[PDB]
Amino acid sequence: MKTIIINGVQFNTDEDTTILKFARDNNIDISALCFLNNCNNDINKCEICTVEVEGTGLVTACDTLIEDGMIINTNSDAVNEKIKSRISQLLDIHEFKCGPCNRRENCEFLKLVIKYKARASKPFLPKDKTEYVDERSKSLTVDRTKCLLCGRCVNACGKNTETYAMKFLNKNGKTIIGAEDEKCFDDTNCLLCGQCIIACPVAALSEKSHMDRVKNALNAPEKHVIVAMAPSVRASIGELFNMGFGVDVTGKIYTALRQLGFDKIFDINFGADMTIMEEATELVQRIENNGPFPMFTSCCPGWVRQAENYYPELLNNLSSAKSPQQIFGTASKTYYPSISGLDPKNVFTVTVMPCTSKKFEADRPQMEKDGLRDIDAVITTRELAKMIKDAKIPFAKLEDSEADPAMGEYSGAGAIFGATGGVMEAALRSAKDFAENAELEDIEYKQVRGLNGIKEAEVEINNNKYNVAVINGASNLFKFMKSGMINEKQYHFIEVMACHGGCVNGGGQPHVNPKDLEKVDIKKVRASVLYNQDEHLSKRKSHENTALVKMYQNYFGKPGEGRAHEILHFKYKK
C-alpha cells in the first residue's frame, strides 16, 4: 500500500487519486476554486488548493497525485499565506458588494474570504460598470466585475456541450470570458443551456431576468396572470429552503404561487401531456408510410439551437409539436379565454423553468398569434425562489394545495419529462396505444431511463420492430452523429436533451457547491421525485388526463389535424 501522513495524521491507501480528492473523502478539507468537472484552469491556475509536501515544497493539490512517502501540509503558514495572497489578489479585480448580489446566500468566494480572512489592497470600485456588463442575450448575462477568471464556465461548456461557445478572449490586453468574437451569445453557436452559470462560483454569470415582467404584470389592473411550473421545479426548489435533496414540494409551490398574487395556478405538465398528444400522433403518421425518419424531439430549445447551428438538415425531421411551454402558452391565449370570460390580450402567461434557454424560446419572433405571445415571461427555479423569499413566504411550513384543474392536471407520462428518457417513455406509452388502438397494460420503458450518455431500445408496435435512441446531453449528440452511430440502423424516434441528466440538471436550477455535490448524485435524486410521482399516479398516460380530453374534444378537435395542426405546431426553416 501507499502511506501518507497529512498533517501528522496517519493514512494508508490503495487509491491513486489527487491530494485534494483523497482529502475530500477523508474529512480533512483543503480549499479549492478553479477545480471542477475533473479539471482545473490549466492556463494560470488559481492555487487555492496549495499544500506543501516536504522535499518538493508548495504544489497544487487538485492535480498533484499522492505518493507513498508523502508528508503534506495544509494549515501550515507558507501554504496559508500563498493562498490568502491569491484570494486578496482576486478581490483587487472583484466588486465586493454582497447583498444586493444574487449569490450572497450561497456564494463560495465570500466563503473563501471569511475563512482565510482576506482583504483586497485597493477594493475595486469601477465608477462605470458598462464595459464589464453584457445583457444583450435573451438567456445569459455577464457581469465581469464579479469574474474570477477561474475557467470553470469554459471547461463546463466544453465537457457538457463540446461547442466551446464560452471562450477565453483577449480584449485589448486583458483576458475576459465571453462568446465568439465577444458577440452576444444568441448570435453564436451557443445553445443558451446555462451550464456555464451552473459551474460559476460567483455572480459573474446569471440568467437574463424576467422578474420585472412578472412584477409589472402582477401590479397591472387588467392583467390576469397565469403561472405554470415545469416538471423539474417541484423536485428541486426545496434545496434553496434548506429542506434537502430529492424532496417533493409540488403542493407547497402551488400555495406559494397563490400567496404571490397569481390569478391561476396551472402546470407545464399539462402542456407535457399536450405535446405527447401531438407528437405521438405524428410518430404514428410517420410510421404510416416510410417516415421521414428519424423523428427527433423538439422540446429542448438547447437542442433546437444545436440543430440549427450544427445540423440544419435535421430541422425537417424534428417534431412539429411545440414544446410543453409553448404549446401550453398557445392554449392559454385561446382555450383558457374561451372557458374563462376573458379577452386574450389581458391574459399574461408566466412559466417557471429549470432552464435559461426557455427564455430565448418564449421570445422567438414567430412564437405568437396575432400580437399575442404564447409565453410572456419565463422565470428560472432560482428566480421563483428569490421572489418567494422577498415576499417572506414561509415555504418549508406551507400547507399543500392543489393546482387549478383546467390546465393544471397531469398524468404520470407528463410527470417524468424532467428526466433523461422521460419524453421518450411518455411518447411510447401513447404511441403504442394509438397505433394498435388498444389500452396497453405494460408501460414501463426502464431501458431508456438513467444516466448513460447514449441509450437505445427496440420497441414492438403492431408486431413490427422500431428503434429508438435517447441522447443525454449535447456532447453526446455530437458523439452520436460524428461516430456514425446514427447509421448503424434506421432510427424511428430520437429524444435529445441538451443538459446531462435532463432538465433536472438544467442551467436555471439551484446551485449545489462541490462539498455537497461530492456526496449527492443530483441528477438521480432530483429525477427520483418525478419517477415516484408517475408510479403513484392513477393516470400514467397523456391521453388519459381528464382536463386535457375536455380541452381537445371541446376546442381543438383531434390531435395532429385541423385546428390542432394550425396553432399547436411550429416548424424551423432556419
Ligand code: SF4
Ligand atoms: S459574487 Fe460573492 S463575493 Fe462577489 S459580491 Fe457577490 S456574494 Fe459577494
Ligand code: SF4
Ligand atoms: S449556455 Fe451552454 S452552449 Fe452557451 S456558453 Fe453556456 S455552457 Fe456553453
Ligand code: SF4
Ligand atoms: S464567469 Fe464565473 S466560471 Fe467563468 S471564469 Fe468568471 S468567475 Fe469563473
Ligand code: SF4
Ligand atoms: S435539457 Fe431541459 S433545462 Fe437543459 S437546455 Fe434542454 S429544455 Fe433546457
Ligand code: FES
Ligand atoms: S483549485 Fe487547484 S489550481 Fe485552482
